[PDB]
Amino acid sequence: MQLTPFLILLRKTLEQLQEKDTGNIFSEPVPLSEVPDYLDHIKKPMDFFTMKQNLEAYRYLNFDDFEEDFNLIVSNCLKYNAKDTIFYRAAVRLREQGGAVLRQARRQAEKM
Ligand SMILES: O=c1[nH]c2[nH]c(=S)[nH]c(=O)c2[nH]1
């Protein structure tokens, strides 16, 4: 497997995942200045901007490490926010819509 086509695929996949987050509520880190208690039980914050930085820092060299950080976006949001909030339901919807995006991307990857 060559690195360049794989990273091209992860760039496209990340774009597709971001497209499912229509509110852009996961686009940037959770602002600790406005959610001061966030790090109390969120041990590894994650967001799409950070994922793009990690991608270009060559920190995703296989599909599972990329998918792991996407799952953190979802799981952190489910953990922090009460079930009856817009945030929690947005994470549920992202988990659902992102799963199809990830399965199709991984099919593409395994063909490489
Ligand atoms: O109360 C909350 N504010 C915020 N902000 C962001 S960016 N993500 C959240 O899960 C959240 N929960």
Side-chain angles (χ1 to χ4, degrees), residues 1-42 44-78 80-103 105-110 112:
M1 214 204 222
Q2 301 173 5
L3 179 59
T4 288
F6 178 70
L7 290 183
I8 285 166
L9 168 66
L10 293 188
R11 291 185 182 100
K12 174 182 186 276
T13 306
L14 185 56
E15 284 175 336
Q16 291 170 327
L17 291 173
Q18 290 217 233
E19 286 179 22
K20 305 299 186 182
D21 172 24
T22 57
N24 281 332
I25 76 135
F26 306 112
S27 61
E28 298 179 337
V30 172
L32 309 176
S33 49
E34 304 167 5
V35 187
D37 71 323
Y38 191 73
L39 274 173
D40 284 15
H41 297 95
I42 306 310
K44 188 181 175 203
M46 188 51 58
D47 64 275
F48 285 128
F49 180 79
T50 297
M51 285 195 69
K52 175 68 173 186
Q53 285 179 313
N54 293 342
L55 191 164
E56 306 299 347
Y58 301 104
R59 305 209 179 91
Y60 301 137
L61 301 178
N62 55 69
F63 202 81
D64 283 286
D65 286 345
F66 172 87
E67 182 170 294
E68 233 175 66
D69 272 348
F70 171 76
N71 287 340
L72 268 181
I73 295 180
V74 171
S75 63
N76 287 344
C77 189
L78 299 180
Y80 183 76
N81 297 287
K83 290 185 84 186
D84 66 4
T85 63
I86 297 279
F87 284 132
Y88 187 101
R89 193 71 209 183
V92 170
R93 201 184 64 178
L94 184 62
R95 181 183 68 205
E96 293 172 352
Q97 298 195 107
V101 170
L102 286 164
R103 178 173 184 160
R106 192 193 285 271
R107 282 186 258 104
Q108 294 186 73
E110 295 175 350
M112 298 170 174

